[model samples]
Target: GGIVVYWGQNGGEGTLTSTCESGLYQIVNIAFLSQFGGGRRPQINLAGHCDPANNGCRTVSDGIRACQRRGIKVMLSIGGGAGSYSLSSVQDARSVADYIWNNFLGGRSSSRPLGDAVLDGVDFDIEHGGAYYDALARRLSEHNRGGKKVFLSAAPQCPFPDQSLNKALSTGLFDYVWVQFYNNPQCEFNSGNPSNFRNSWNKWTSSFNAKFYVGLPASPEAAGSGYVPPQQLINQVLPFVKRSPKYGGVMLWDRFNDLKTKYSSKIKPSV
Candidate 1:
């Protein structure tokens, strides 16, 4: 089954229904809860929409619950490109894992950020972080109870050795890895050639024993480079990747650009 993550501005202005309608319902990562930085206690926020107090927050949590009800995997992502976040130490990693478990995963707590919506997993979109994330991964995994596993995932760069998540990936604890193949044109895609992209795809698939995805920009503007048009993606990329043993399908950079280009609408039928 193929999955797509929706990020940026309230998940493309709450297009969960439209997303599921496209049959790309394997998973949806609501990006950038932004880790609590400045070497303080770990925390998460919906960009400022719903703080810990739940002040004036609506729709987002409801949408998450709706997606989960439909058997879609919805996850709260941490550490995006623009965020003051990094694990300061091993203790800090443990704190962040506890925060995520109590607030987002199966652990029960009154201060839960997303209300009653139990998110299916946590995605480490760690653009800037330290090696302690493996500790974080282990701590989060320890919270798993009664066969309700807390899905751990990562979004690393397409390079062979991802600078941010490499150590965490080395822990061999991640269940899903959505490698960002955009922005990095040298290894992502070349001048109308997919050899670079395919080679890196093979490397990532073999590097980790986890389901891997080909992450791309939904439109030209979404990323500086590596935006395959819908037709080209189906005709050129899908065939090569679908054969991989750990192939997990594609992930659009965001929901806003996806809606603008109607990328998923065009490609989902074939993906």
Candidate 2:
């Protein structure tokens, strides 16, 4: 088990090179390609830079390669806290998968977004989306049949039955599931109360088959609630969660918060 993190929005952290060298995370997810629009050609955005047409694109490309050389798996994360994204139909789902394959994966495309950097996989951080993602997962799985394996991952909100990804998770196609355990106090530990969070964790562990992760805010301000101090997380949550069969370690919310609070660094040894 190792730490997982998302990059692209650092409070002003340096390059992707710095992030990979930090030695805190094994997997880095590039956040938010397209939020609301999923046409045959959807917009891809990383921080403020979108697609290869932007100037800072190559820097991102270089960062990805650097991480790959260091043996860290990087992935493109789609959807976010708020977005108009949703799969209207099965055809739309298949088209989106194809677009991801050609643009970011092994498939060839004249206008590949991230250059020749073939990402390890795609992550569905679907905060708002329709239920057709099951079809999308199936289509992506089909693409993985022949060539370099494309891993599937998700970052669903921590709730008994993930509202956004219940149907898709039922397909059992995802390899990693890092549930966001922040922002929602109802199912997350508050101050020192862990009852609700413990119950929800048990439910999620029983329900999802993918490698499970406990997501947390790297800093207090990074989320509205559920910010466990690094020491407390190491002494409390990790020990209990690590006992689970599918436990895959912890996941921080974003690079920016991690940089600010140094939470990943403080907890890396314990995780």
Candidate 3:
């Protein structure tokens, strides 16, 4: 089991290089390519880190490369919580996949947003309703140029069938599906009990072949609800969830929250 983290959502979270250097996370997702496919030109929002307009965002390539050098898998996460993006058609999904390949993956693009660094994969953090995401997943898989594997992941909400990425998961192209276990009270760690969390876990694991992660908020305030303290997670939650063969590891919401609570640090040993 390994820790996966969602970085670049908040600039105050610190540098990507720092996150990797801490040796807490094996996978790092740089969120997000906030806008695309809804008749708007594709765009990214790395928060206060850098600007894509003046080509400032390309500077992140240094940190991105540094993290990869240290054995951390860096991924470009798309569709944030508040992003205005929805695939209009299957062709649009294909176009978006091409854009990602050229800009972030192995494909060549003169105006790459993250400069020369090639990201390991893509993470789907779709927050709202959209069509043809399954097509998008297939398109992304088809864009693999060389022998290099293009890792695909999704952070769907904790419901049995996620509203956004349900169809995408059905395609079984995703290598990792870290379900958002926070901001959802019903099927999460509630009142210090892991019953609800385990129930959801069983359904999620049985529904797919991808390695499943129990995504949690790093801190209590990181989300509206579903913050399982590291101690309780290790003692109560993990003992049950980790029994599954499909369990991958834990996923934190953001780097900023993890820094405050050090949840990743505390849980790393157990995970």
Per TM-score, the best of the predicted structures is 3
Per-residue C-alpha lDDT of model 1 across residues 1-271, encoded as one tens digit per residue: 4757765344334455565545555788876667554465444555434444442333556767777777888877888876678887888888888777777777777766566677888888888655788988888877565526788888888977888899888889888898888888767765377889999999999899998888888889888988888888898888888899898888887777877788877877777
Runs of candidate 2 with Cα error greater than 4 angstroms are 36-40, 49-56
Candidates' lDDT values, in order? 0.75, 0.80, 0.88
Candidate 1: lDDT of 123?
Answer: 88
> Once superposed on the true structure, which residue ranges of model 1 sit more than 4 Å away at CA?
8-12, 15-23, 37-55, 145-147
Error of 3 at 269 (Å): 0.6
Q: Which residue pairs collide, candidate 1?
A: none
Best by lDDT: 3
lDDT of 3 at 234: 88
- TM-score: the better of candidates 1 and 2: 2
Full-model lDDT, candidate 3: 0.88
Model 3 worst lDDT run, 10 consecutive residues:
140-149
**lDDT accuracy of residue 57 in candidate 2:** 62
Report the Cα RMSD per candidate: 2.3, 1.9, 1.3
Of candidates 3 and 1, the better by TM-score: 3
Q: What value of lDDT does candidate 2 attain over all alpha carbons?
A: 0.80
